PDB file of all heavy atoms in Angstrom:
ATOM      1  N   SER A 120     -30.097 -13.119  13.563  1.00 23.26           N
ATOM      2  CA  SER A 120     -29.147 -14.101  12.989  1.00 23.26           C
ATOM      3  C   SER A 120     -29.027 -13.890  11.550  1.00 23.26           C
ATOM      4  O   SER A 120     -29.274 -12.682  11.093  1.00 23.26           O
ATOM      5  CB  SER A 120     -29.705 -15.577  13.206  1.00 23.26           C
ATOM      6  OG  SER A 120     -30.967 -15.718  12.757  1.00 23.26           O
ATOM      7  N   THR A 121     -28.645 -14.840  10.724  1.00 19.88           N
ATOM      8  CA  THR A 121     -28.577 -14.665   9.262  1.00 19.88           C
ATOM      9  C   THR A 121     -29.921 -14.397   8.696  1.00 19.88           C
ATOM     10  O   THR A 121     -30.868 -14.925   9.302  1.00 19.88           O
ATOM     11  CB  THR A 121     -27.758 -15.865   8.582  1.00 19.88           C
ATOM     12  OG1 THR A 121     -26.635 -16.098   9.325  1.00 19.88           O
ATOM     13  CG2 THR A 121     -27.514 -15.712   7.136  1.00 19.88           C
ATOM     14  N   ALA A 122     -29.953 -13.591   7.570  1.00 16.11           N
ATOM     15  CA  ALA A 122     -31.240 -13.214   6.868  1.00 16.11           C
ATOM     16  C   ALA A 122     -31.996 -12.100   7.521  1.00 16.11           C
ATOM     17  O   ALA A 122     -32.908 -11.572   7.018  1.00 16.11           O
ATOM     18  CB  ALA A 122     -32.183 -14.350   6.474  1.00 16.11           C
ATOM     19  N   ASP A 123     -31.457 -11.700   8.724  1.00 17.52           N
ATOM     20  CA  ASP A 123     -31.899 -10.457   9.437  1.00 17.52           C
ATOM     21  C   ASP A 123     -30.892  -9.433   9.257  1.00 17.52           C
ATOM     22  O   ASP A 123     -31.170  -8.247   9.609  1.00 17.52           O
ATOM     23  CB  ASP A 123     -32.232 -10.791  10.869  1.00 17.52           C
ATOM     24  CG  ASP A 123     -33.213 -11.901  11.041  1.00 17.52           C
ATOM     25  OD1 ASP A 123     -34.126 -12.023  10.157  1.00 17.52           O
ATOM     26  OD2 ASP A 123     -33.043 -12.677  11.908  1.00 17.52           O
ATOM     27  N   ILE A 124     -29.654  -9.769   8.864  1.00 15.57           N
ATOM     28  CA  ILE A 124     -28.540  -8.761   8.760  1.00 15.57           C
ATOM     29  C   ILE A 124     -28.808  -7.884   7.587  1.00 15.57           C
ATOM     30  O   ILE A 124     -28.981  -8.364   6.515  1.00 15.57           O
ATOM     31  CB  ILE A 124     -27.157  -9.522   8.717  1.00 15.57           C
ATOM     32  CG1 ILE A 124     -26.842 -10.383   9.861  1.00 15.57           C
ATOM     33  CG2 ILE A 124     -26.016  -8.591   8.412  1.00 15.57           C
ATOM     34  CD1 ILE A 124     -25.712 -11.270   9.684  1.00 15.57           C
ATOM     35  N   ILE A 125     -28.704  -6.520   7.850  1.00 18.73           N
ATOM     36  CA  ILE A 125     -28.737  -5.573   6.749  1.00 18.73           C
ATOM     37  C   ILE A 125     -27.237  -5.339   6.414  1.00 18.73           C
ATOM     38  O   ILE A 125     -26.590  -4.911   7.329  1.00 18.73           O
ATOM     39  CB  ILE A 125     -29.459  -4.283   7.277  1.00 18.73           C
ATOM     40  CG1 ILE A 125     -30.761  -4.658   7.970  1.00 18.73           C
ATOM     41  CG2 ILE A 125     -29.783  -3.375   6.039  1.00 18.73           C
ATOM     42  CD1 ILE A 125     -31.459  -3.510   8.558  1.00 18.73           C
ATOM     43  N   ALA A 126     -26.912  -5.578   5.141  1.00 19.44           N
ATOM     44  CA  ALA A 126     -25.501  -5.414   4.672  1.00 19.44           C
ATOM     45  C   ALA A 126     -25.039  -3.970   4.636  1.00 19.44           C
ATOM     46  O   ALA A 126     -25.867  -3.198   4.084  1.00 19.44           O
ATOM     47  CB  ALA A 126     -25.327  -6.115   3.466  1.00 19.44           C
ATOM     48  N   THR A 127     -23.896  -3.690   5.081  1.00 20.88           N
ATOM     49  CA  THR A 127     -23.316  -2.273   5.030  1.00 20.88           C
ATOM     50  C   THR A 127     -22.243  -2.168   4.032  1.00 20.88           C
ATOM     51  O   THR A 127     -21.295  -2.922   4.066  1.00 20.88           O
ATOM     52  CB  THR A 127     -22.841  -1.768   6.420  1.00 20.88           C
ATOM     53  OG1 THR A 127     -22.302  -0.521   6.247  1.00 20.88           O
ATOM     54  CG2 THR A 127     -21.971  -2.729   7.146  1.00 20.88           C
ATOM     55  N   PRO A 128     -22.436  -1.370   3.018  1.00 24.17           N
ATOM     56  CA  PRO A 128     -21.415  -1.161   1.965  1.00 24.17           C
ATOM     57  C   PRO A 128     -20.110  -0.395   2.475  1.00 24.17           C
ATOM     58  O   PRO A 128     -20.229   0.173   3.571  1.00 24.17           O
ATOM     59  CB  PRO A 128     -22.137  -0.299   0.862  1.00 24.17           C
ATOM     60  CG  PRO A 128     -23.113   0.421   1.617  1.00 24.17           C
ATOM     61  CD  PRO A 128     -23.586  -0.491   2.755  1.00 24.17           C
ATOM     62  N   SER A 129     -19.044  -0.622   1.823  1.00 23.02           N
ATOM     63  CA  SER A 129     -17.781   0.060   2.257  1.00 23.02           C
ATOM     64  C   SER A 129     -17.864   1.535   2.012  1.00 23.02           C
ATOM     65  O   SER A 129     -18.569   1.960   1.063  1.00 23.02           O
ATOM     66  CB  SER A 129     -16.599  -0.611   1.552  1.00 23.02           C
ATOM     67  OG  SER A 129     -15.380  -0.185   2.075  1.00 23.02           O
ATOM     68  N   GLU A 130     -17.083   2.255   2.811  1.00 22.72           N
ATOM     69  CA  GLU A 130     -17.059   3.804   2.623  1.00 22.72           C
ATOM     70  C   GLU A 130     -15.884   4.321   1.845  1.00 22.72           C
ATOM     71  O   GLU A 130     -15.746   5.617   1.894  1.00 22.72           O
ATOM     72  CB  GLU A 130     -17.138   4.301   4.010  1.00 22.72           C
ATOM     73  CG  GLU A 130     -18.321   3.886   4.885  1.00 22.72           C
ATOM     74  CD  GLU A 130     -18.442   4.605   6.179  1.00 22.72           C
ATOM     75  OE1 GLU A 130     -17.603   5.457   6.526  1.00 22.72           O
ATOM     76  OE2 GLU A 130     -19.414   4.393   6.937  1.00 22.72           O
ATOM     77  N   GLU A 131     -15.019   3.500   1.224  1.00 19.11           N
ATOM     78  CA  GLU A 131     -13.929   4.080   0.593  1.00 19.11           C
ATOM     79  C   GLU A 131     -13.638   3.392  -0.833  1.00 19.11           C
ATOM     80  O   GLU A 131     -13.759   2.123  -0.901  1.00 19.11           O
ATOM     81  CB  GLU A 131     -12.612   3.956   1.320  1.00 19.11           C
ATOM     82  CG  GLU A 131     -12.552   4.973   2.525  1.00 19.11           C
ATOM     83  CD  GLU A 131     -13.059   4.506   3.850  1.00 19.11           C
ATOM     84  OE1 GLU A 131     -13.236   3.302   3.966  1.00 19.11           O
ATOM     85  OE2 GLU A 131     -13.347   5.314   4.693  1.00 19.11           O
ATOM     86  N   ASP A 132     -13.418   4.136  -1.843  1.00 19.73           N
ATOM     87  CA  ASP A 132     -12.914   3.571  -3.107  1.00 19.73           C
ATOM     88  C   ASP A 132     -12.060   4.581  -3.845  1.00 19.73           C
ATOM     89  O   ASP A 132     -12.305   4.737  -5.088  1.00 19.73           O
ATOM     90  CB  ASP A 132     -14.128   3.262  -4.018  1.00 19.73           C
ATOM     91  CG  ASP A 132     -15.185   4.420  -4.094  1.00 19.73           C
ATOM     92  OD1 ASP A 132     -15.600   4.816  -2.910  1.00 19.73           O
ATOM     93  OD2 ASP A 132     -15.527   4.765  -5.124  1.00 19.73           O
ATOM     94  N   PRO A 133     -10.982   5.195  -3.333  1.00 22.24           N
ATOM     95  CA  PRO A 133     -10.187   6.213  -4.094  1.00 22.24           C
ATOM     96  C   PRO A 133      -8.941   5.638  -4.693  1.00 22.24           C
ATOM     97  O   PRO A 133      -8.163   6.568  -5.056  1.00 22.24           O
ATOM     98  CB  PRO A 133      -9.876   7.075  -2.786  1.00 22.24           C
ATOM     99  CG  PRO A 133      -9.554   6.088  -1.732  1.00 22.24           C
ATOM    100  CD  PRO A 133     -10.335   4.846  -2.002  1.00 22.24           C
ATOM    101  N   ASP A 134      -8.859   4.386  -4.946  1.00 23.80           N
ATOM    102  CA  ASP A 134      -7.590   3.639  -5.106  1.00 23.80           C
ATOM    103  C   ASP A 134      -6.612   4.321  -6.243  1.00 23.80           C
ATOM    104  O   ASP A 134      -7.021   4.182  -7.392  1.00 23.80           O
ATOM    105  CB  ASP A 134      -7.818   2.215  -5.441  1.00 23.80           C
ATOM    106  CG  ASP A 134      -8.521   1.487  -4.250  1.00 23.80           C
ATOM    107  OD1 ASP A 134      -8.741   2.021  -3.290  1.00 23.80           O
ATOM    108  OD2 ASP A 134      -8.997   0.343  -4.599  1.00 23.80           O
ATOM    109  N   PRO A 135      -5.458   4.833  -5.795  1.00 23.14           N
ATOM    110  CA  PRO A 135      -4.571   5.308  -6.826  1.00 23.14           C
ATOM    111  C   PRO A 135      -3.634   4.132  -7.328  1.00 23.14           C
ATOM    112  O   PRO A 135      -2.882   4.385  -8.250  1.00 23.14           O
ATOM    113  CB  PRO A 135      -3.661   6.330  -6.018  1.00 23.14           C
ATOM    114  CG  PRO A 135      -4.402   6.655  -4.733  1.00 23.14           C
ATOM    115  CD  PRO A 135      -5.243   5.342  -4.481  1.00 23.14           C
ATOM    116  N   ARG A 136      -3.816   2.944  -6.806  1.00 22.97           N
ATOM    117  CA  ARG A 136      -3.121   1.776  -7.236  1.00 22.97           C
ATOM    118  C   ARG A 136      -3.421   1.532  -8.734  1.00 22.97           C
ATOM    119  O   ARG A 136      -2.516   0.989  -9.435  1.00 22.97           O
ATOM    120  CB  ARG A 136      -3.548   0.500  -6.372  1.00 22.97           C
ATOM    121  CG  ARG A 136      -3.791   0.955  -4.919  1.00 22.97           C
ATOM    122  CD  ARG A 136      -3.799  -0.254  -4.034  1.00 22.97           C
ATOM    123  NE  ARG A 136      -4.403  -0.056  -2.664  1.00 22.97           N
ATOM    124  CZ  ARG A 136      -4.392  -0.895  -1.668  1.00 22.97           C
ATOM    125  NH1 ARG A 136      -3.856  -2.124  -1.857  1.00 22.97           N
ATOM    126  NH2 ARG A 136      -4.909  -0.613  -0.557  1.00 22.97           N
ATOM    127  N   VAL A 137      -4.703   1.786  -9.167  1.00 21.28           N
ATOM    128  CA  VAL A 137      -4.924   1.744 -10.571  1.00 21.28           C
ATOM    129  C   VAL A 137      -4.520   3.271 -11.071  1.00 21.28           C
ATOM    130  O   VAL A 137      -4.864   4.231 -10.357  1.00 21.28           O
ATOM    131  CB  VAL A 137      -6.355   1.474 -10.921  1.00 21.28           C
ATOM    132  CG1 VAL A 137      -7.401   2.230 -10.274  1.00 21.28           C
ATOM    133  CG2 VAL A 137      -6.591   1.486 -12.451  1.00 21.28           C
ATOM    134  N   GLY A 138      -3.806   3.285 -12.121  1.00 23.69           N
ATOM    135  CA  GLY A 138      -3.303   4.682 -12.523  1.00 23.69           C
ATOM    136  C   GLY A 138      -1.857   4.873 -11.965  1.00 23.69           C
ATOM    137  O   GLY A 138      -1.425   5.981 -12.024  1.00 23.69           O
ATOM    138  N   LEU A 139      -1.189   3.804 -11.476  1.00 24.59           N
ATOM    139  CA  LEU A 139       0.221   3.946 -11.044  1.00 24.59           C
ATOM    140  C   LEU A 139       1.181   3.810 -12.257  1.00 24.59           C
ATOM    141  O   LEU A 139       0.789   4.001 -13.403  1.00 24.59           O
ATOM    142  CB  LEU A 139       0.528   2.884  -9.993  1.00 24.59           C
ATOM    143  CG  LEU A 139       0.030   3.084  -8.570  1.00 24.59           C
ATOM    144  CD1 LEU A 139       0.497   1.996  -7.728  1.00 24.59           C
ATOM    145  CD2 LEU A 139       0.449   4.410  -8.064  1.00 24.59           C
ATOM    146  N   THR A 140       2.483   3.596 -11.910  1.00 24.26           N
ATOM    147  CA  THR A 140       3.509   3.245 -12.889  1.00 24.26           C
ATOM    148  C   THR A 140       3.793   4.444 -13.885  1.00 24.26           C
ATOM    149  O   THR A 140       4.251   4.223 -15.029  1.00 24.26           O
ATOM    150  CB  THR A 140       3.524   1.824 -13.624  1.00 24.26           C
ATOM    151  OG1 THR A 140       4.774   1.590 -14.097  1.00 24.26           O
ATOM    152  CG2 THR A 140       2.471   1.635 -14.633  1.00 24.26           C
ATOM    153  N   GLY A 141       3.478   5.669 -13.465  1.00 24.03           N
ATOM    154  CA  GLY A 141       3.724   6.861 -14.206  1.00 24.03           C
ATOM    155  C   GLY A 141       5.221   7.166 -14.029  1.00 24.03           C
ATOM    156  O   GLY A 141       5.910   6.639 -13.114  1.00 24.03           O
ATOM    157  N   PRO A 142       5.799   8.088 -14.840  1.00 20.68           N
ATOM    158  CA  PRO A 142       7.160   8.468 -14.633  1.00 20.68           C
ATOM    159  C   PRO A 142       7.287   9.222 -13.273  1.00 20.68           C
ATOM    160  O   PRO A 142       6.364   9.728 -12.764  1.00 20.68           O
ATOM    161  CB  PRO A 142       7.586   9.278 -15.815  1.00 20.68           C
ATOM    162  CG  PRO A 142       6.208   9.780 -16.273  1.00 20.68           C
ATOM    163  CD  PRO A 142       5.299   8.724 -15.952  1.00 20.68           C
ATOM    164  N   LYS A 143       8.653   9.252 -12.765  1.00 20.90           N
ATOM    165  CA  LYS A 143       8.850   9.969 -11.461  1.00 20.90           C
ATOM    166  C   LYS A 143       8.150   9.196 -10.310  1.00 20.90           C
ATOM    167  O   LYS A 143       7.803   9.823  -9.273  1.00 20.90           O
ATOM    168  CB  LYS A 143       8.473  11.524 -11.413  1.00 20.90           C
ATOM    169  CG  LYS A 143       9.380  12.326 -12.281  1.00 20.90           C
ATOM    170  CD  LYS A 143       8.848  13.743 -12.365  1.00 20.90           C
ATOM    171  CE  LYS A 143       9.669  14.630 -13.327  1.00 20.90           C
ATOM    172  NZ  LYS A 143       9.126  15.981 -13.397  1.00 20.90           N
ATOM    173  N   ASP A 144       7.877   7.848 -10.461  1.00 18.29           N
ATOM    174  CA  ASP A 144       7.284   7.065  -9.373  1.00 18.29           C
ATOM    175  C   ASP A 144       8.191   5.841  -9.091  1.00 18.29           C
ATOM    176  O   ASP A 144       8.931   5.458 -10.026  1.00 18.29           O
ATOM    177  CB  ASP A 144       5.833   6.666  -9.643  1.00 18.29           C
ATOM    178  CG  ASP A 144       4.768   7.755  -9.577  1.00 18.29           C
ATOM    179  OD1 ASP A 144       5.097   8.764  -8.941  1.00 18.29           O
ATOM    180  OD2 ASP A 144       3.742   7.578 -10.195  1.00 18.29           O
ATOM    181  N   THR A 145       8.046   5.248  -7.921  1.00 15.47           N
ATOM    182  CA  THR A 145       8.784   4.032  -7.624  1.00 15.47           C
ATOM    183  C   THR A 145       7.868   3.049  -6.980  1.00 15.47           C
ATOM    184  O   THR A 145       7.045   3.419  -6.165  1.00 15.47           O
ATOM    185  CB  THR A 145       9.960   4.324  -6.619  1.00 15.47           C
ATOM    186  OG1 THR A 145       9.502   4.754  -5.400  1.00 15.47           O
ATOM    187  CG2 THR A 145      11.035   5.120  -7.348  1.00 15.47           C
ATOM    188  N   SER A 146       8.023   1.732  -7.404  1.00 18.32           N
ATOM    189  CA  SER A 146       7.037   0.697  -6.833  1.00 18.32           C
ATOM    190  C   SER A 146       7.302   0.407  -5.347  1.00 18.32           C
ATOM    191  O   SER A 146       8.390   0.693  -4.920  1.00 18.32           O
ATOM    192  CB  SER A 146       7.035  -0.588  -7.663  1.00 18.32           C
ATOM    193  OG  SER A 146       6.412  -0.296  -8.883  1.00 18.32           O
ATOM    194  N   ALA A 147       6.278  -0.168  -4.657  1.00 18.41           N
ATOM    195  CA  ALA A 147       6.415  -0.410  -3.228  1.00 18.41           C
ATOM    196  C   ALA A 147       7.523  -1.378  -2.954  1.00 18.41           C
ATOM    197  O   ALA A 147       8.290  -1.250  -1.984  1.00 18.41           O
ATOM    198  CB  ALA A 147       5.141  -0.955  -2.686  1.00 18.41           C
ATOM    199  N   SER A 148       7.728  -2.529  -3.833  1.00 18.30           N
ATOM    200  CA  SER A 148       8.811  -3.413  -3.564  1.00 18.30           C
ATOM    201  C   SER A 148      10.150  -2.786  -3.677  1.00 18.30           C
ATOM    202  O   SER A 148      11.096  -3.195  -3.102  1.00 18.30           O
ATOM    203  CB  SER A 148       8.582  -4.583  -4.603  1.00 18.30           C
ATOM    204  OG  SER A 148       7.302  -5.045  -4.619  1.00 18.30           O
ATOM    205  N   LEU A 149      10.349  -1.861  -4.618  1.00 16.79           N
ATOM    206  CA  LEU A 149      11.592  -1.101  -4.739  1.00 16.79           C
ATOM    207  C   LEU A 149      11.781  -0.187  -3.552  1.00 16.79           C
ATOM    208  O   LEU A 149      12.917   0.003  -3.096  1.00 16.79           O
ATOM    209  CB  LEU A 149      11.551  -0.295  -5.989  1.00 16.79           C
ATOM    210  CG  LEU A 149      12.878   0.533  -6.415  1.00 16.79           C
ATOM    211  CD1 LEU A 149      14.078  -0.447  -6.412  1.00 16.79           C
ATOM    212  CD2 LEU A 149      12.710   1.255  -7.682  1.00 16.79           C
ATOM    213  N   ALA A 150      10.662   0.436  -3.053  1.00 15.35           N
ATOM    214  CA  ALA A 150      10.807   1.361  -1.899  1.00 15.35           C
ATOM    215  C   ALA A 150      11.164   0.651  -0.661  1.00 15.35           C
ATOM    216  O   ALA A 150      11.476   1.423   0.336  1.00 15.35           O
ATOM    217  CB  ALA A 150       9.542   2.122  -1.842  1.00 15.35           C
ATOM    218  N   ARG A 151      10.889  -0.610  -0.496  1.00 16.55           N
ATOM    219  CA  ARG A 151      11.115  -1.305   0.725  1.00 16.55           C
ATOM    220  C   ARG A 151      12.475  -2.055   0.790  1.00 16.55           C
ATOM    221  O   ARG A 151      12.569  -3.110   1.609  1.00 16.55           O
ATOM    222  CB  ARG A 151       9.954  -2.343   1.027  1.00 16.55           C
ATOM    223  CG  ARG A 151       8.631  -1.537   1.307  1.00 16.55           C
ATOM    224  CD  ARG A 151       7.449  -2.587   1.425  1.00 16.55           C
ATOM    225  NE  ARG A 151       7.212  -3.313   0.291  1.00 16.55           N
ATOM    226  CZ  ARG A 151       7.507  -4.617   0.112  1.00 16.55           C
ATOM    227  NH1 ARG A 151       7.952  -5.324   1.028  1.00 16.55           N
ATOM    228  NH2 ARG A 151       7.233  -5.269  -1.092  1.00 16.55           N
ATOM    229  N   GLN A 152      13.425  -1.732  -0.062  1.00 17.67           N
ATOM    230  CA  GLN A 152      14.738  -2.430   0.004  1.00 17.67           C
ATOM    231  C   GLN A 152      15.417  -2.121   1.285  1.00 17.67           C
ATOM    232  O   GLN A 152      15.452  -0.949   1.763  1.00 17.67           O
ATOM    233  CB  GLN A 152      15.646  -2.011  -1.181  1.00 17.67           C
ATOM    234  CG  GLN A 152      16.816  -2.696  -1.309  1.00 17.67           C
ATOM    235  CD  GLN A 152      16.685  -4.165  -1.612  1.00 17.67           C
ATOM    236  OE1 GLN A 152      16.931  -5.022  -0.801  1.00 17.67           O
ATOM    237  NE2 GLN A 152      16.211  -4.512  -2.835  1.00 17.67           N
ATOM    238  N   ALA A 153      16.063  -3.123   1.889  1.00 16.70           N
ATOM    239  CA  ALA A 153      16.863  -3.002   3.110  1.00 16.70           C
ATOM    240  C   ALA A 153      18.303  -2.535   2.656  1.00 16.70           C
ATOM    241  O   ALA A 153      19.177  -3.352   2.738  1.00 16.70           O
ATOM    242  CB  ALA A 153      16.853  -4.199   3.946  1.00 16.70           C
ATOM    243  N   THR A 154      18.448  -1.320   2.180  1.00 16.98           N
ATOM    244  CA  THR A 154      19.809  -0.760   1.645  1.00 16.98           C
ATOM    245  C   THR A 154      20.603  -0.370   2.837  1.00 16.98           C
ATOM    246  O   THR A 154      21.823  -0.609   2.789  1.00 16.98           O
ATOM    247  CB  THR A 154      19.493   0.398   0.703  1.00 16.98           C
ATOM    248  OG1 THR A 154      18.689  -0.066  -0.285  1.00 16.98           O
ATOM    249  CG2 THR A 154      20.799   1.031   0.180  1.00 16.98           C
ATOM    250  N   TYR A 155      20.064   0.089   3.947  1.00 19.62           N
ATOM    251  CA  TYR A 155      20.818   0.613   5.100  1.00 19.62           C
ATOM    252  C   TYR A 155      21.458  -0.524   5.903  1.00 19.62           C
ATOM    253  O   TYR A 155      20.665  -1.499   6.288  1.00 19.62           O
ATOM    254  CB  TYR A 155      19.979   1.505   6.002  1.00 19.62           C
ATOM    255  CG  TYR A 155      20.609   1.863   7.274  1.00 19.62           C
ATOM    256  CD1 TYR A 155      21.707   2.687   7.337  1.00 19.62           C
ATOM    257  CD2 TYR A 155      19.954   1.516   8.504  1.00 19.62           C
ATOM    258  CE1 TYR A 155      22.337   3.027   8.522  1.00 19.62           C
ATOM    259  CE2 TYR A 155      20.591   1.901   9.738  1.00 19.62           C
ATOM    260  CZ  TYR A 155      21.710   2.641   9.733  1.00 19.62           C
ATOM    261  OH  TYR A 155      22.305   2.919  10.889  1.00 19.62           O
ATOM    262  N   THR A 156      22.703  -0.386   6.197  1.00 16.43           N
ATOM    263  CA  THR A 156      23.322  -1.398   7.229  1.00 16.43           C
ATOM    264  C   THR A 156      24.295  -0.605   8.004  1.00 16.43           C
ATOM    265  O   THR A 156      25.078   0.218   7.480  1.00 16.43           O
ATOM    266  CB  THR A 156      23.836  -2.569   6.514  1.00 16.43           C
ATOM    267  OG1 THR A 156      24.358  -3.448   7.520  1.00 16.43           O
ATOM    268  CG2 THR A 156      24.894  -2.276   5.481  1.00 16.43           C
ATOM    269  N   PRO A 157      24.411  -0.903   9.357  1.00 17.26           N
ATOM    270  CA  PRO A 157      25.346  -0.223  10.172  1.00 17.26           C
ATOM    271  C   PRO A 157      26.758  -0.950  10.183  1.00 17.26           C
ATOM    272  O   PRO A 157      27.579  -0.607  10.932  1.00 17.26           O
ATOM    273  CB  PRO A 157      24.749  -0.201  11.596  1.00 17.26           C
ATOM    274  CG  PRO A 157      23.301  -0.563  11.416  1.00 17.26           C
ATOM    275  CD  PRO A 157      23.275  -1.517  10.112  1.00 17.26           C
ATOM    276  N   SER A 158      26.845  -2.059   9.375  1.00 15.58           N
ATOM    277  CA  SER A 158      28.116  -2.864   9.312  1.00 15.58           C
ATOM    278  C   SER A 158      29.208  -1.963   8.856  1.00 15.58           C
ATOM    279  O   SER A 158      30.380  -2.121   9.315  1.00 15.58           O
ATOM    280  CB  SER A 158      28.003  -4.052   8.479  1.00 15.58           C
ATOM    281  OG  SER A 158      29.187  -4.692   8.248  1.00 15.58           O
ATOM    282  N   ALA A 159      28.980  -1.057   7.966  1.00 17.78           N
ATOM    283  CA  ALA A 159      29.940  -0.019   7.515  1.00 17.78           C
ATOM    284  C   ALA A 159      29.746   1.232   8.155  1.00 17.78           C
ATOM    285  O   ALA A 159      28.856   1.402   8.954  1.00 17.78           O
ATOM    286  CB  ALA A 159      30.025   0.066   6.005  1.00 17.78           C
ATOM    287  N   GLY A 160      30.521   2.252   7.773  1.00 13.26           N
ATOM    288  CA  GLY A 160      30.350   3.586   8.333  1.00 13.26           C
ATOM    289  C   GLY A 160      31.291   3.808   9.571  1.00 13.26           C
ATOM    290  O   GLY A 160      31.204   4.891  10.225  1.00 13.26           O
ATOM    291  N   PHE A 161      32.138   2.840   9.887  1.00 14.27           N
ATOM    292  CA  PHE A 161      33.040   2.885  11.124  1.00 14.27           C
ATOM    293  C   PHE A 161      34.059   3.993  10.895  1.00 14.27           C
ATOM    294  O   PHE A 161      34.195   4.576   9.790  1.00 14.27           O
ATOM    295  CB  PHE A 161      33.725   1.566  11.293  1.00 14.27           C
ATOM    296  CG  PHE A 161      32.809   0.401  11.681  1.00 14.27           C
ATOM    297  CD1 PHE A 161      33.199  -0.926  11.520  1.00 14.27           C
ATOM    298  CD2 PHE A 161      31.604   0.684  12.213  1.00 14.27           C
ATOM    299  CE1 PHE A 161      32.407  -1.912  11.942  1.00 14.27           C
ATOM    300  CE2 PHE A 161      30.733  -0.332  12.648  1.00 14.27           C
ATOM    301  CZ  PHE A 161      31.160  -1.592  12.444  1.00 14.27           C
TER     302      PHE A 161
END
């Protein structure tokens, strides 16, 4: 039960999220725009 659990640390920490906003990059919110629509193109 509790107090017998040996805690396991996480196996990943390579986050490029810190160090972002360089030139030639686009943010995730900009990259997820719904620009495409089939309403036109007829």
Side-chain angles (χ1 to χ4, degrees):
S120 52
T121 311
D123 305 321
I124 298 171
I125 316 173
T127 174
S129 185
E130 301 186 358
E131 284 92 14
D132 47 304
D134 306 349
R136 325 196 191 186
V137 52
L139 279 182
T140 200
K143 297 173 183 174
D144 286 339
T145 59
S146 289
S148 315
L149 183 58
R151 293 175 298 109
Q152 187 62 251
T154 303
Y155 170 62
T156 180
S158 169
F161 291 163

